Structure 1
Amino acid sequence: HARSTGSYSLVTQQPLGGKAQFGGQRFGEMEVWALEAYGAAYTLQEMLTVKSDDVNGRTKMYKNIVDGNHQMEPGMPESFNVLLKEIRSLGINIELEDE
């Protein structure tokens, strides 16, 4: 099985799972720890933002590669905003702060 770009989920905007749906391999928390054990931070930023769920950061990443450039933009993952709304859907107020 292999996948470059396929169809994405509906709520978290992450790639689907399984061979039938042309999904990508899950990059679990153990692999996150393995990357943290190295000095790898840019690779982790890639796997978390520009390959999985940064909607505004992966469309530009595809355009950069076809243009010959190899550079990312950190963006902001869309799997964390939803969480905020979820916690904001309760009586709890969780918010970000100033620059």
Structure 2
Amino acid sequence: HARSTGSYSLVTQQPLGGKAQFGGQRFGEMEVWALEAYGAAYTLQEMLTVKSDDVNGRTKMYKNIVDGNHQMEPGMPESFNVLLKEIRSLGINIELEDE
């Protein structure tokens, strides 16, 4: 198998495959403790922000790559903003103190 970019899921915007380019591999919670055991914090910040989930940060990483400038502007993933709307849809209020 092989995948560079394809069809993304519906509610969470992470990859899956039905269009001849199936989903990406699975970066489990076991393969993330192997990147924290090292100091690989710049491989881990992109392996779960720009390569999978961040909606308006994974297209900039596609124009910076064709333009010969390898650098990322991460942002915040969408799988987390779908968690602030489900913990708010109970009575529970939850926010982000900005400072």
Give the TM-score normalised by the residue count of structure 2. 0.94
Aligned-residue identity in percent:
100
Q: 1:23 to 1:59 in 2, by over 3 A?
A: same
* CA apart distance, 1:22: 1.3
The Cα offsets for residues 41-87 of structure 1, whole Å up to 9 and x where unpaired, read as 00000101000100111000001000000001121100000001000
71-80 vs 19-28, greater mean Cα deviation: 19-28
Match of 1:92? 92
Give the number of aligned pairs.
99
Match of 2:53? 53
Instruction: Report if aligned partners of 1:8, 1:15 keep a CA contact under 8 Å in 2.
Output: yes
Instruction: Report if aligned partners of 1:61, 1:72 keep a CA contact under 8 Å in 2.
Output: yes
Instruction: Report if aligned partners of 1:18, 1:24 keep a CA contact under 8 Å in 2.
Output: no
- Return 5+ residue gaps in structure 1 as ranges: none
Please give the secondary structure, in 2, of the residue aligned with 1:34: helix
Q: 1:38 to 1:97 in 2, by over 3 A?
A: same
The Cα offsets for residues 9-62 of structure 1, whole Å up to 9 and x where unpaired, read as 000100015896611001000000000000000000010100010011100000
15-24 vs 35-44, greater mean Cα deviation: 15-24
Q: 1:38 to 1:18 in 2, by over 3 A?
A: farther
- Return 5+ residue gaps in structure 2 as ranges: none
Give the TM-score normalised by the residue count of structure 1. 0.94
